[PDB]
Design a protein around this ligand. Structure first.
Ligand SMILES: Cc1cc2nc3c(=O)[nH]c(=O)nc-3n(C[C@H](O)[C@H](O)[C@H](O)COP(=O)(O)OP(=O)(O)OC[C@H]3O[C@@H](n4cnc5c(N)ncnc54)[C@H](O)[C@@H]3O)c2cc1C
Ligand SMILES: Cc1cc2nc3c(=O)[nH]c(=O)nc-3n(C[C@H](O)[C@H](O)[C@H](O)COP(=O)(O)OP(=O)(O)OC[C@H]3O[C@@H](n4cnc5c(N)ncnc54)[C@H](O)[C@@H]3O)c2cc1C
Ligand SMILES: Cc1cc2nc3c(=O)[nH]c(=O)nc-3n(C[C@H](O)[C@H](O)[C@H](O)COP(=O)(O)OP(=O)(O)OC[C@H]3O[C@@H](n4cnc5c(N)ncnc54)[C@H](O)[C@@H]3O)c2cc1C
Ligand SMILES: Cc1cc2nc3c(=O)[nH]c(=O)nc-3n(C[C@H](O)[C@H](O)[C@H](O)COP(=O)(O)OP(=O)(O)OC[C@H]3O[C@@H](n4cnc5c(N)ncnc54)[C@H](O)[C@@H]3O)c2cc1C
Ligand SMILES: O=c1[nH]c(=O)n([C@H]2C[C@H](O)[C@@H](COP(=O)(O)O)O2)cc1Br
Ligand SMILES: O=c1[nH]c(=O)n([C@H]2C[C@H](O)[C@@H](COP(=O)(O)O)O2)cc1Br
Ligand SMILES: O=c1[nH]c(=O)n([C@H]2C[C@H](O)[C@@H](COP(=O)(O)O)O2)cc1Br
Ligand SMILES: O=c1[nH]c(=O)n([C@H]2C[C@H](O)[C@@H](COP(=O)(O)O)O2)cc1Br
Lengths: 217, 216, 215, 216
């Protein structure tokens, strides 16, 4: 399962542990019980605020995204991350270039096409300078500081269902930057495919965001 | 699928697992824009990570356990915050007559006034009386959340535990150690055993370069 | 500042870092930024779900509570704890004995005041058996396993305003066991004194519980 | 307490709760005696009993380059609040490495040229950013052309235990030089507020390699 986001990014599901029944399973222990009834428990827990059972469902994603996007994403402390290093590796020529449609809805002095053009020009000069510094023997950890925030980076993300839901509440929302919204939708799609009952219950009883109720999957 | 019996009626049962040794290898490699490789190389990285103290990669390995243990053991266990728990409720369900009765050998080394067997006998008695009082209150209409307050700390409880490899190793350092209570140690050995079965490379590397305990 | 809870328990403030303005300062370092403007920002943050700024206010409490209460309290992982050790020190003769009014509203085959008695009896026999074992040479970590769940323990609790609010949402609520609700009420009271603005705003826009809305 | 770091950065102590005695009070669970108290701090540090130090909390105000902040924010056991590029107009403040930063590395161009190369690109980037903002492009979009050396500010609230982990990892030669400088500043303040804990830390638990070589 891999989903393309923006111009060069993506969200890919690396691994998953458990399913909706994992949460049903965990929840049952409270009443010395085990695993149509199970589906009803998910709703109950969701609408009543029993979030802990969903912590036993865990996902590991492989994400390709712009650093300005990663910086916001990494603010979610209840999860695990492992990212590409700008200190250790030679960064490749890959940057997020917004399409003219990105400025749809805003009045600008210069054409959307020009805006897209200027971002590219800057990206191009920045990367050349970066390579020139490295070729000259400048340490990678120093040379990379001239690279812009729209530079693509990669990382693994292991997070459980409760934290992922908090993530969707905050990122699969209109107040979050459009770019991370797009990633959140892909995360939602995958979440829905692996835990359909929890997902449906989540949208109907606890989701606090606004876009997942208008945009399918 | 794994089950280890602990104490007289307890147990540690592996319910699920996500990833294996290579899950940490994958996570780690990404820092160099690389992926997996041969076994010799990948296994070398794991020990490398363990040696230098790079533990984040091991967080991508997650375990889900089903544990049955006495409350005094569980209390110490739930002190490990970097994990998830779901436990049997004394407020909601009627508790079963199951308590941890120490065997006479638990007193080995300690010279006692009364024979060990007697200590065992006395523990069972108090437990029996407490439980009868509990059943008595429950059957007379007393709310369960109130009636259970007479139950002793050796009452058995059950819970689910989802924890990743890194937090798990911290658990073993602290609980797979002679400084921890013998009872919790036994559970830690069972946890280590399962960790060994599922992530051989990580475990071995752990024991050789990071494990700070003494019983493993 | 100390508040007694139940028959022998309590909640006392040990220390606190910051106040309503601590949250105001944390948040202002976002837009690169007086009373009305500040208290309004606080109500604004609370109303929209911007909770991180409240993490910069921290409290440390000293709590004396029954273990069954502590087992529920310790489930709140986003915080720090340090409790008395039952295997290191001899436990004192202090247990939570519910008052007859605790069974109020319930129809029981045994008079409430009789239930109170049965609980005391167990406590007494369990504790004596415990001292009997210890004096007999049984190590404390083993002898104490016969003690009941209403045995009082003590601990230090350091938590920030955000986690504290999650705690009040879940514990200062009728779905929580009454005994812990009482402690949560005490926690809320101290929190109100130190952060009136944050507290006021919490009740009005984020508080999900029910009893703080009536007590 | 405010310490200048790099060319435009700084570490400022905003607030602090408790001191060395706070860890002591927590460990004993009560509420003095330097001999015993300090001895206890060292005992706790020597045997790995770290939870008591979580009762000591700091709030810092930091100004640092995004590439430094990104590494810093990887420390999850803490609280943060940073300036927003989506909401605020960014100031013309970037970290420009001085020639000395390249002492020891053999380059095909004079270290001063590297400084100029970096300064020029930073200048171009900021100028395009300003033109984008002026023409009407949304802040959150216009700032994506800004370099990783753009300075940002944030509030950091962390307890002594997590801060000690931070020092282990950052006040070390393996961490990038730029964040090492901040860690030193963090260490000075910590040392100033909790002299007993810091000394005990350096003596028994610290895993880094610079704090035992550089005063305060
Ligand atoms: C021999 C022994 C004796 C003990 N005696 C006592 C006692 O007398 N009183 C008592 O109350 N407890 C006692 N404990 C419990 C101990 O204090 C810890 O609570 C327990 O070991 C859980 O460990 P942890 O904090 O390392 O783990 P977790 O809570 O699971 O945390 C794992 C890691 O994340 C961290 N971490 C998590 N949360 C925070 C935070 N809020 N701030 C900073 N870092 C954080 C640390 O790096 C930690 O090692 C004892 C434990 C042992 C093994
Ligand atoms: C009325 C009531 C009934 C209950 N019944 C039961 C029961 O039958 N069985 C049982 O085991 N427990 C039960 N609990 C305990 C409950 O499951 C929680 O453990 C407890 O409320 C502590 O809450 P918390 O997880 O929200 O808080 P904290 O552990 O303090 O966490 C605060 C916040 O950080 C989060 N968080 C922390 N750690 C993680 C993580 N690892 N993954 C994802 N998010 C995380 C969430 O956003 C959370 O709200 C009950 C509680 C109440 C109030
Ligand atoms: C020299 C150096 C090189 C690095 N290289 C890379 C790299 O190539 N790629 C990369 O992505 N990162 C890299 N990092 C970042 C590193 O992986 C950690 O994210 C960073 O050091 C923050 O540390 P921490 O996990 O110990 O701290 P915190 O996140 O603050 O956590 C403190 C303690 O609580 C714990 N803890 C917190 N959360 C969890 C959890 N979810 N599960 C288990 N335990 C938990 C542990 O006991 C931990 O030590 C590097 C750091 C250094 C110092
Ligand atoms: C529209 C929008 C605007 C934003 N603007 C800003 C800004 O201007 N400046 C800025 O710095 N950030 C900003 N953020 C980031 C925000 O402050 C959070 O850090 C981010 O959403 C991650 O969320 P979290 O804290 O809920 O999640 P996580 O860090 O993953 O935590 C999940 C849950 O555990 C909890 N938790 C975890 N750690 C702690 C802790 N240490 N103390 C108490 N509770 C804890 C809470 O219950 C939390 O919801 C913004 C986010 C959004 C969506
Ligand atoms: O929508 C947002 N999402 C987010 O995660 N932040 C966090 C990210 C970063 O640590 C700092 C400033 O981010 P921006 O430049 O993207 O606004 O606060 C801020 C905003 Br607004
Ligand atoms: O070895 C120990 N392990 C542990 O987790 N505690 C925590 C458990 C409980 O929250 C409180 C008191 O525990 P004991 O009564 O078991 O000592 O401190 C204490 C000790 Br000593
Ligand atoms: O209201 C509750 N609060 C709580 O914290 N638990 C946690 C406490 C303990 O770890 C386990 C069982 O608790 P009780 O016996 O008190 O129900 O689940 C359960 C319930 Br119901
Ligand atoms: O020393 C380091 N410190 C750090 O915090 N990272 C984390 C920061 C970021 O999330 C990602 C890539 O960082 P660099 O570009 O700085 O290498 O891994 C990496 C290295 Br190496």
């Amino acid at each position: 399962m891999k989903i393309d986001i923006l111009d060069k990014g993506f969200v890919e599901l690396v691994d998953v542990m458990g399913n909706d029944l994992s949460a049903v399973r965990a929840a049952r222990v409270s009443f010395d019980m085990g695993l149509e009834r199970d589906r009803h428990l998910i709703e109950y827990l969701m609408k009543h605020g029993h979030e802990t059972p969903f912590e036993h469902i865990v996902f590991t994603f492989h994400v390709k995204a712009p650093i300005f996007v990663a910086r916001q994403w990494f603010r979610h402390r209840i999860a695990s991350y492992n990212e590409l290093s700008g200190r250790y590796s030679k960064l490749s020529y890959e940057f997020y270039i917004p399409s003219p449609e990105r400025l749809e809805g805003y009045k600008t002095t210069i054409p959307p096409e020009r805006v897209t053009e200027k971002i590219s020009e800057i990206v191009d000069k920045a990367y050349r300078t970066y390579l020139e510094l490295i070729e000259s023997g400048v340490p990678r950890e120093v040379a990379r500081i001239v690279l812009p925030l729209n530079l693509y980076t990669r990382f693994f993300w292991t997070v459980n269902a409760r934290s992922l839901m908090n993530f969707l509440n905050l990122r699969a929302d209109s107040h979050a930057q459009w770019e991370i919204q797009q990633y959140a939708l892909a995360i939602a799609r995958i979440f829905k495919e692996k835990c359909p009952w929890t997902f449906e219950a989540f949208l109907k009883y606890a989701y606090k965001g606004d876009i997942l109720k208008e945009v399918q999957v």
